[PDB]
């Protein structure tokens, strides 16, 4: 090995290195202080004169004299294997469980090679969640990405925890489904409170999620460039598993807004002009870089489903982060401070919540017969039930007829029994029969979007 | 309805004005730093 | 040719040394891998390569060579049944070669080069050729194909090859000016294939759905626009006007979108049926496709690739419908490639030259005559998808300024089960007058009067429906109830096409004019009935309305045996009462 | 003849010429690529070290070796004749009719000079238009400028092609002199859809106003310099035919918003600070150039009356 | 320079009804008239030039139409001030700067106008000055500061525009000159936002 | 100007309800003006000669027709004398710092001549520290019966 | 360096009704309180400092007005400890840096307050740190980064700002210390937009 000493211009998070024309662009270096300590850094802006090393941590022990830099792993990769399904990491990929660090089966580049679209069929078999208001009204299918437009003060992380520890594919509605396929949950969390990291490790290790869920948890006080590199690590592990062993991989990306602010900080650090509202102009393609690595494949059997969760800043949707995510992904689900301060867990009001891929995904053979009719009927019924509920403050309850009194009792019982769940583990059949029990409160003949035979076959 | 659309559109355009000023100034200061890299010799 | 080296790499901007005398905007293979850059901003010796792909793992002092040609496309036979990226690299042969990902720094050619096509010569040695003249035919899928001399080339032809079973790398002819001429040729993508004159629209682009030529014509050689929301079925409309068009060559361009909203294009479009000869539609349709994670300038120049390929098909005397997808995504691509250039922004965030680039896009579309001198037309059915949904954004603003036929699609009408989802109270055409003499000469001498009448009715219905909305649609008066029932049956019968029906998939001008005259005759027959002595509701239950409700589902090859029969039938049916 | 070479730095629509000292600020050059195609360019920011040629067209395939730059016509002159009544021109003004090019009669500069305001009389006589609210409540006095505001989806093109043809001055409502003052309409199309160009050709040929009018149609797929240069061509031919033949020319500037996007598109070259919403702040001086060029002069019977039609970008 | 500045106690009789009934201007005072297009502004400036109690009207119009200047020069040598007789034109010095004239001359023009106003206030004359469309003078400052590559602030207007504008308006007032005469110069500044 | 004039002429600490006997010393006015025009100047000095305060007051006048950079020195120069007369002679100094908007425009001019990155609406970042070092040279100290009470007059731009 | 961190089962018993009942702070947790000028930040913080259940209160004035600080220094030793009977200043280490006091000292003050609170949480106490005006520390970062000729982030702060703020709010959290015992830092941070 060689060590590039003789370095000038240490400034902020950057430092220059004279006559290092061997560092390729995007090379990982380790900065050995004269005092025996080693930092990590990434090489940008190589020249014939000097290369630039951005430093992960704060530059504090450095000096112009006693500084050396050493190349390690000239493009950033990771060692990947299957045995790592209970192993916490932090961005880099150091184990933090106090357990033996693994040996590689492969050595994959952390950046994504994009998918040839001809090798992607359409995603058309579902995956339940446990959350009945997800799995009834606006379903999730294997391969789709759909975000959670969480509020800035709502419990997003409990929802991420519960859906990570509860969601399992069910093949017994399909064509003689076997359970030889495992189900890998890859869970990345970036820019997080210490308290909620302890909450996540408690929640994962309490119900046996830890046996089958790999974790990339890095904190806020970690360097921002590790928050850039973390979902690259999570998605290349997801791609390795699902496309090299034909698994079913659900990936959950906590707090994409932290990824956004780390991207903006590193853009302004590496000295380039920001664009819309002080954001980098390449945020769209860099955000597609870690969304569009999911899907299903013609020929293979894998399934990469991607739930990112993003905190909107103060609940607008023309902010650039939810604009790009609602402009890239397939639909959204949306939390609400209204229904949460009213007091319901999970706080999903569904009336702005929408999938754009349920139409291809559900149906007989796939999951169930009546599913789309139930979804549309409940959507329109709760839609006019909300407006009747806000109208009745003026009109007076006696001054409305029998039918809209039934609608208002429908909304009142609906938000108590269908949505309000807490930790109540529900599957899809209980979801449908509670949907029909709620729809029984409307009189028959009012159910105009459900054909007659389903009424005769399910009413109660 | 239209008065509130006019007010919201006016606030949008004055924020766009502020953003054009600041990207102009950052273009200027990047010009300064490139000029200073030239100035050192 | 010009082999220089790299002296700086900053992100995707590779500053290269040694290329003094190198041109502007060329290919510039980079490194031992070889990445296709582009050359901007020369300075003394140096040249600023912008690299399309990620520059992870390149060093200083690595060789960089150029080609000299600008960003070109290749043209010839075999382009049909083609799927490409934004820089025309056929993704079927790429998944065939190198796995299911896309390895950076790979190169294939657009054409196949290893299929012996069947040459047929048509000029003789002793002739001379000017640019744009055909000199040899190739049959591809039973679609006739015509090899042109590339434009701005002339010369006297010698060494003409006989009827040979050849490949694309055999020059069929040579000039006496040096200058061999092969089947393929390259062309710079940022300008039009020059053509001797354009025309003015006197031909209606036969879409085939029975609203969007009748009330909202688009006039072949024209230009449309559709904003497409989820919950309206844009894709089935694109398949319908790709399946039942007047145009014989469709260029579909997916200029970057959701990947799963493009895999349905990949797995549904080659299982359509070309409903003219019998096979699938892919034997006459070129397909460009992009995800949102491909290299950026590929996604930018994607639609220029599409337009230039469509011009290559228009110079063979054809009828090209270019349908472009989601132009706002292309605006996002242009915005991102602007922010790499550190450009001063515009109204929303765009470049200042957005209107100029959309002008250069749309105005390369019209009914035109070739340099060989025959007619062909390259009209555009290009879409728009509003990100914000607000129609004040500059992309929809400049699109609505430039295009000549603006349609709308609603989330409300498909929610009310109205297929297609066209709004007729917010959409507008401009091709009425230029299609007026064609309509008089080739439809009838009252078809413009009759579309004036139905446009009056569809203005009038929503003009009057407020007291219907408030009071109640039972207690109106006895002309306006007839206007409501006529407008309702206008909606439910003249507007509503089930595109998956076997015989209702298509509507030529005589069927539309026939149903159109039938419903106006019903109006001014029932109005005579209600103005003489009777009320409305006893007219509303009648086998006339059954015959109008079946009149769209009768085949056109029973239509002379349906039209005047039902006409006199309605006539006597109210003459008796 | 007199070909500078030595191009140091080509960036965008700008390039830097070494050793240039004989050039002049605001002069015109042609750039000659080695392949054999010229391009127009303008000479700005002339220094002893180098001179900044703004390129007019897109740059493509230029080099630093064979880029032959040559000075062409120091003042931005134009060969103007009388008998240009009724021929389509380019945005530059080159003919597109198949007809031969015109013999010049005065090669005067296209920028024009400010009128001396102690030489202008008041606009004091009338012209008849077709449109009744323009004739009675509004009134088009001969010798002024007035715009037509319009909207995004509103018919202003037909009002343009209507006032170009059903508007002639009535001389016998005043005293007499009716032969010696004929009428002419200069019609500059700043930025057009091709459909509009077809409509204007068919309507002008139909009504026969082409025997009085002069056509400066843009064909707006051309490079933006032709769009920005056609109003000065139009008003230069208008001022020649109105102050050297005593006519009463009505001028129609077609859209002015394609004009202003052309100005904000060339304005993002020098990195000058943009004004309100991206329009560069010298736009008021440029519109004062292409508006207050009109007016009436004492001693002459000339009048140049301006109708700039402009749509709002939004209402 | 003057001996001493007085206090304004006598109204500049502006002549129009609202402008002295409701919101009057004193003889040494300054007034600002905003107003967008289509709100007159030139009818009002020419009316103040015609009908006042000035002694000399210095009409300095910068960044402006030509028809206004030739209107003022056509229709003044027949109308008559209320005090004297003869043409009105023999008490009005006007400094035209039409908006097609070159952009740097405006900052010369405004100070030429106020200098002539002080030379006439030194001769016992209650000078009225009409500085028309000083927003174009602000555009002239913006154009030269953007030519000279300094920092812009608040939409390109260079940050010493308040110092320039304050030192302009502060030249007005009611003084007593060194000869012993009194005098006052008033400024009507038409701003076009 | 008239509110500041009325608090200048007829404001008085009331010793009797405070319960300390009396010393009943009237005030001392440090009137520092930064670009008041001429009329406000006339009004303030005639108000002060009509209330008879010019035998116990000081004026640092920096008028509109004065040059535009000495506005940075004017308030600090006034408050130096204010600190002096308070903390060496046991006074009750009231300081009228007129029209701080002209101070802030002069600060904006000297910040933009030196290219410095401004905060909101083109004002530089150190405006906080400079308005701090104008304002917080005021208050009362322990033991010394001198005191400084400031009225700075702002002019809100868009009110 | 601390041995282990935990999850908090103990509230910060504030003393005010809303800021204990409807919006609680757990003893390891942190809290932010933004508010415009003239709204009641400082009186809220002094209410906390007078009536919390803290063994030791570190009070950090980072860029404020001086009378706030001297009011605290006069007003606390005349009062009563809620826990013991002592004077209330005996549980408060006060770190002050008022606005006139020099500019780059603010980063020093805001790190020194949290490190003295970290010393006292290493003694098994339970510490309340009321630090106000970290916006002024961001503004001091704007100050010194403006003279390095650097490229600022959104609106003018140097772009490692949120990294510094996350590193600052890291240090709390109901921790089991090195000597076996447990302790806590809670942080009440005022942010002034
Ligand atoms: N609980 C309270 N009771 C009475 N007055 C209060 C109370 N809280 C705040 N105030 C008043 O609110 C004002 C705001 O003080 P301050 O904390 O400086 O506001 P901010 O810091 O929010 O600008 C103080 O003058 C104080 O008198
Ligand atoms: N042309 C100039 N002359 C003097 N000072 C300037 C100029 N331009 C900017 N400044 C200001 O003066 C400071 C000079 O910074 P610099 O010379 O890099 O380091 P130092 O702070 O040691 O002087 C910058 O912060 C800048 O805001
Ligand atoms: Mg406060």
């Amino acid at each position: 090995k060689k060590e590039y000493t003789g370095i000038t211009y240490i400034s902020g998070p950057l430092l220059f290195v004279e006559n290092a024309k061997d560092l390729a662009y995007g090379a990982i270096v380790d900065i050995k202080d004269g005092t025996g300590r080693v930092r990590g850094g990434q090489v940008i802006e190589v020249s014939e004169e000097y290369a630039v090393i951005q430093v992960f941590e704060e530059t504090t022990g450095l000096d112009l004299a006693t500084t050396s830099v050493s190349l390690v792993e000239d493009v950033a990769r990771l060692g990947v294997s299957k045995e790592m399904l209970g192993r916490r990491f932090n961005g880099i990929g150091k184990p933090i469980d106090g357990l033996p660090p693994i040996t590689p089966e492969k050595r994959l580049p952390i950046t994504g090679l994009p998918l040839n679209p001809v090798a992607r069929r359409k995603p058309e078999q579902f995956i339940q969640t446990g959350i009945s208001t997800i799995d009834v009204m606006n379903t999730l299918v294997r391969g789709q990405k759909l975000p959670i437009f969480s509020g800035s003060g709502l419990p997003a992380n409990e929802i991420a925890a519960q859906i990570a520890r509860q969601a399992t594919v069910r093949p017994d509605l399909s064509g003689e489904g076997e359970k030889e396929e495992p189900f890998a949950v890859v869970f990345a969390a970036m820019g997080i409170t210490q308290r909620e990291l302890s909450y996540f490790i408690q929640e994962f290790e309490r119900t046996g999620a830890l046996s089958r869920s790999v974790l990339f948890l890095n904190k806020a006080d970690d360097p921002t460039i590790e928050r850039i590199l973390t979902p690259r690590m999570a998605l290349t592990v997801a791609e390795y598993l699902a496309f090299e062993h034909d698994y079913h991989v659900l990936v959950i990306l906590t707090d994409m807004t932290n990824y956004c602010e780390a991207l903006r900080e590193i853009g302004a650090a590496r000295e380039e002009i920001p664009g819309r509202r002080g954001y980098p102009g390449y945020m769209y393609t860099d955000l597609a870089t870690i969304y569009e690595r999911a899907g299903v494949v013609e020929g293979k059997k894998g399934s990469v489903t991607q739930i990112p969760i993003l905190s909107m800043p103060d609940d607008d949707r023309t902010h650039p982060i939810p604009d790009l995510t609602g402009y890239i992904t397939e639909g959204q689900i949306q939390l609400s401070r209204e229904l949460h301060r009213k007091g319901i867990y999970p706080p999903i009001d569904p009336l702005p919540s929408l999938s754009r891929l349920m139409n291809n995904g559900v149906g007989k053979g796939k999951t169930r017969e009546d599913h789309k009719q139930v979804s549309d009927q409940l959507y329109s019924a709760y839609a006019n039930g909300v407006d009747i509920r806000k109208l009745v403050a003026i009109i007076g309850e006696d001054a409305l007829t029998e039918n809209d009194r039934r609608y208002l009792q429908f909304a009142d019982a609906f938000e108590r029994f269908f949505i309000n769940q807490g930790q109540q583990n529900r599957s899809i059949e209980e979801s449908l029969q509670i949907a029909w029990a709620l729809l029984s409160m409307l009189p028959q003949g009012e159910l105009k979007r459900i054909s007659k035979d389903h009424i005769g076959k399910y009413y109660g | 309805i239209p008065g509130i659309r006019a007010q919201i559109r006016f606030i949008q355009q004055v924020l766009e004005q502020r953003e054009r000023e600041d990207t102009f100034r950052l273009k200027r200061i990047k010009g300064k730093i490139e000029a200073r890299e030239a100035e050192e010799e | 040719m010009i082999q220089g080296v790299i002296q700086k790499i900053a992100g995707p901007a590779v500053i290269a040394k040694g290329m003094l005398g190198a041109r502007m905007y060329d290919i510039c293979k980079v490194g031992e891998e070889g990445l296709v850059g582009e050359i901007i901003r020369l300075d003394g010796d140096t040249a600023f390569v912008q690299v399309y792909e990620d520059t992870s793992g390149l060093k200083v002092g690595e060789p960089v060579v150029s080609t000299g040609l600008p960003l070109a496309v290749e043209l010839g036979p075999g382009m049909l049944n083609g799927i490409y990226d934004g820089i025309q690299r056929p993704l079927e042969r790429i998944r065939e070669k190198t796995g299911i990902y896309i390895t950076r720094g790979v190169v294939v050619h657009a054409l196949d080069r290893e299929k012996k096509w069947a040459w047929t010569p048509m000029v003789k040695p002793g002739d001379e050729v000017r640019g744009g003249m055909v000199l040899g035919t190739v049959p591809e899928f039973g679609f006739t194909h015509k090899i042109l001399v590339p434009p701005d080339v002339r010369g006297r032809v010698k060494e003409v090859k006989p009827a040979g079973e050849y490949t694309v790398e055999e020059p069929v002819v040579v000039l006496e000016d040096g200058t061999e001429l092969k089947m393929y040729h390259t062309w710079p993508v940022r300008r039009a294939r020059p053509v001797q004159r354009k025309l003015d629209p006197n031909t209606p682009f036969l879409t085939g759905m029975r609203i969007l030529d009748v009330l909202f014509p688009v006039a072949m050689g024209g230009t449309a626009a559709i904003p497409g929301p989820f919950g309206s079925g844009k894709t089935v409309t694109q398949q319908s006007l790709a399946k039942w068009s007047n145009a014989d060559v469709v260029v579909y361009v997916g200029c970057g979108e959701r990947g799963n909203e493009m895999t349905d294009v990949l797995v549904e479009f080659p299982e359509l049926t070309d409903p003219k000869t019998g096979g699938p539609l892919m034997h006459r349709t070129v397909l460009i496709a992009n995800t949102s994670n491909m290299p950026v300038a590929a996604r930018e120049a994607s639609i220029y690739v599409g337009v230039t390929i469509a011009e290559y098909f228009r110079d063979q005397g054809f009828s090209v419908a270019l349908m472009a997808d989601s132009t706002s995504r292309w605006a996002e691509a242009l915005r991102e490639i602007s922010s790499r250039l550190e450009e001063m922004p515009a109204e929303e965030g765009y470049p200042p030259y957005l209107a100029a680039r959309l002008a250069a896009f749309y105005e390369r579309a019209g009914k035109v005559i070739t340099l060989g001198g025959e007619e062909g037309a390259v009209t555009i059915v290009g879409a728009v998808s509003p990100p914000g949904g607000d129609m004040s954004e500059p992309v929809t603003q400049s699109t609505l300024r430039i295009v000549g036929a603006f349609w709308r699609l609603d989330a409300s009408l498909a929610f009310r089960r109205h297929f297609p989802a066209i709004n007729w109270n917010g959409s507008y055409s401009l091709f009425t007058s230029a299609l007026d003499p064609w309509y008089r000469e080739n439809v009838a001498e009252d078809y413009p009067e009759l579309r004036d009448a139905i446009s009056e009715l569809l203005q009038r219905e929503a003009g009057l429906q407020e007291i219907v909305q408030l009071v109640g649609p039972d207690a109106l008066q006895d002309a306006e109830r007839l206007v409501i029932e006529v407008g309702r049956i206008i909606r439910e019968d003249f507007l509503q096409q089930n595109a998956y029906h076997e015989v209702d998939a298509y509507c030529s001008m005589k069927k539309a004019y026939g149903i159109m005259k039938m419903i106006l005759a019903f109006y001014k027959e029932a109005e005579a009935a209600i103005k003489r002595g009777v009320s409305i509701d006893e007219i509303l239950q009648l086998p006339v309305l059954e015959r109008i409700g079946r009149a769209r589902y009768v085949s056109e090859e029973e239509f002379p045996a349906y039209f005047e029969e039902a006409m006199k039938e309605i006539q006597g049916a109210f003459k008796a009462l």
Side-chain angles (χ1 to χ4, degrees), chain A residues 165-233:
Chain A
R165 68 178 170 84
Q166 185 175 356
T168 303
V169 295
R170 287 182 64 250
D172 283 333
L173 272 303
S174 64
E176 185 65 28
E178 294 178 353
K179 289 183 175 66
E180 58 89 20
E181 47 87 18
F183 187 72
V185 176
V186 180
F187 185 79
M190 56 191 74
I192 58 173
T193 307
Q194 178 70 45
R195 186 263 308 160
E196 72 179 3
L197 181 143
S198 180
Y199 176 71
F200 279 122
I201 62 171
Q202 181 178 1
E203 192 73 28
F204 275 147
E205 295 173 358
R206 196 265 318 281
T207 181
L210 191 273
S211 65
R212 58 175 177 87
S213 63
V214 70
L215 311 180
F216 289 109
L217 309 174
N218 57 358
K219 296 176 261 73
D221 56 347
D222 295 328
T224 68
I225 183 167
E226 292 178 353
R227 285 198 295 271
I228 296 299
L229 291 180
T230 308
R232 269 76 171 174
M233 310 292 173

Side-chain angles (χ1 to χ4, degrees), chain C residues 60-291:
Chain C
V60 182
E62 290 183 353
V64 166
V65 295
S66 293
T67 309
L69 299 175
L71 181 63
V73 295
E74 295 183 355
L75 297 172
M79 190 174 294
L80 292 170
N81 199 0
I83 300 167
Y84 298 96
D85 59 353
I87 54 173
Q88 197 183 5
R89 295 184 292 119
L91 293 172
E92 179 65 32
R93 291 191 292 169
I94 297 168
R95 60 93 54 82
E96 182 181 2
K97 285 171 93 287
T98 58
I100 68 168
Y101 293 99
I102 295 171
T103 64
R104 63 179 177 90
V106 76
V107 55
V108 296
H109 299 285
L111 304 175
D112 201 4
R113 301 183 186 275
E114 292 179 355
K115 288 183 178 179
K116 286 185 179 293
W117 296 106
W119 171 260
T120 297
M122 288 180 294
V123 293
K124 297 306 290 181
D127 295 328
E128 65 178 0
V129 64
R130 300 295 303 273
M133 183 179 175
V134 72
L135 50 91
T137 47
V138 170
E140 185 181 2
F141 296 115
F143 184 80
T144 305
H145 186 73
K146 289 174 68 178
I147 298 171
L148 294 173
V149 54
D152 74 23
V153 177
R154 56 95 51 215
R156 180 174 296 277
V157 60
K158 60 100 175 178
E159 192 176 358
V160 182
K161 287 186 177 293
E165 191 177 3
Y166 290 159
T167 183
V168 75
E169 281 291 329
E170 298 297 324
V172 288
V173 293
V174 191
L175 299 176
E176 284 186 353
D177 303 331
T179 315
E180 295 178 352
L181 293 174
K182 299 177 183 181
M183 291 182 182
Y184 72 103
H185 61 278
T186 61
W187 184 254
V189 78
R190 295 187 182 275
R191 54 95 170 265
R193 292 175 63 86
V195 283
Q196 62 183 358
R197 80 182 69 253
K198 299 181 186 295
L199 283 81
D200 47 355
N202 294 118
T203 294
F205 176 71
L206 299 175
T207 297
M209 63 186 76
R210 62 172 63 91
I211 177 167
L212 294 179
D213 56 351
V214 178
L215 275 76
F216 292 100
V218 70
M220 183 179 174
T223 296
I226 47 169
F230 179 71
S232 297
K234 176 177 67 65
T235 60
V236 64
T237 60
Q238 291 184 357
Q239 293 180 358
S240 71
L241 74 95
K243 187 171 180 176
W244 293 101
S245 176
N246 197 2
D248 61 354
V249 172
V250 178
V251 176
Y252 181 75
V253 176
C255 190
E257 60 176 357
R258 303 182 175 92
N260 289 316
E261 201 175 359
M262 195 174 71
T263 187
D264 57 354
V265 177
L266 289 174
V267 307
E268 287 181 355
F269 202 81
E271 61 191 3
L272 294 175
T273 299
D274 188 1
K276 301 297 179 290
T277 307
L281 185 59
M282 287 297 292
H283 302 288
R284 65 183 182 92
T285 303
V286 183
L287 202 155
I288 309 298
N290 304 117
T291 58

Side-chain angles (χ1 to χ4, degrees), chain C residues 365-543:
Chain C
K367 184 174 176 66
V368 74
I369 62 172
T370 63
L371 293 176
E374 63 184 2
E375 291 183 355
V378 63
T379 186
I380 286 178
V381 198
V384 55
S385 64
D390 292 329
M391 299 298 175
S392 295
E393 60 187 3
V395 177
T396 301
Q397 181 178 0
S398 296
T399 301
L400 192 145
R401 184 173 63 243
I402 290 173
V403 306
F406 175 70
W407 298 341
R408 292 181 64 245
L409 277 76
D410 293 335
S412 177
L413 272 72
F415 179 75
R416 201 178 296 112
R417 292 176 289 111
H418 187 276
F419 287 96
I422 297 298
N423 204 167
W424 56 91
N425 287 320
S427 298
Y428 67 98
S429 173
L430 290 84
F431 294 106
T432 65
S433 299
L435 290 179
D436 197 359
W438 191 83
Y439 278 158
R440 297 288 180 185
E441 290 293 328
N442 301 117
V443 179
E445 289 87 3
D446 54 353
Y447 179 79
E449 296 172 351
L450 219 162
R451 63 177 286 172
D452 291 332
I454 286 181
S455 65
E456 190 271 333
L457 289 178
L458 293 178
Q459 181 64 257
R460 181 62 179 168
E461 183 177 1
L464 71 95
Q465 68 186 0
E466 180 64 31
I467 61 169
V468 175
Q469 185 179 3
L470 193 144
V471 176
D474 57 353
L476 268 301
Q477 301 173 0
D478 290 332
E480 295 177 353
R481 290 294 295 274
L482 187 60
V483 176
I484 287 296
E485 291 293 328
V486 165
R488 180 257 187 189
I489 194 166
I490 277 297
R491 183 178 296 112
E492 299 182 358
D493 181 70
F494 185 76
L495 300 182
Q496 187 176 4
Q497 176 177 3
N498 192 2
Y500 293 98
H501 196 274
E502 186 177 1
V503 81
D504 199 70
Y506 182 71
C507 180
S508 67
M509 286 299 175
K510 297 296 182 181
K511 186 181 179 184
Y513 177 74
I515 295 170
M516 206 169 173
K517 183 184 283 185
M518 285 167 71
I519 190 63
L520 256 292
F522 174 72
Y523 177 72
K524 68 180 181 180
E525 188 71 23
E527 202 277 331
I530 203 165
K531 78 183 182 182
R532 65 98 192 262
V534 300
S535 69
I536 181 63
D537 293 329
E538 72 277 22
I539 295 170
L540 302 182
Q541 47 184 354
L542 185 65

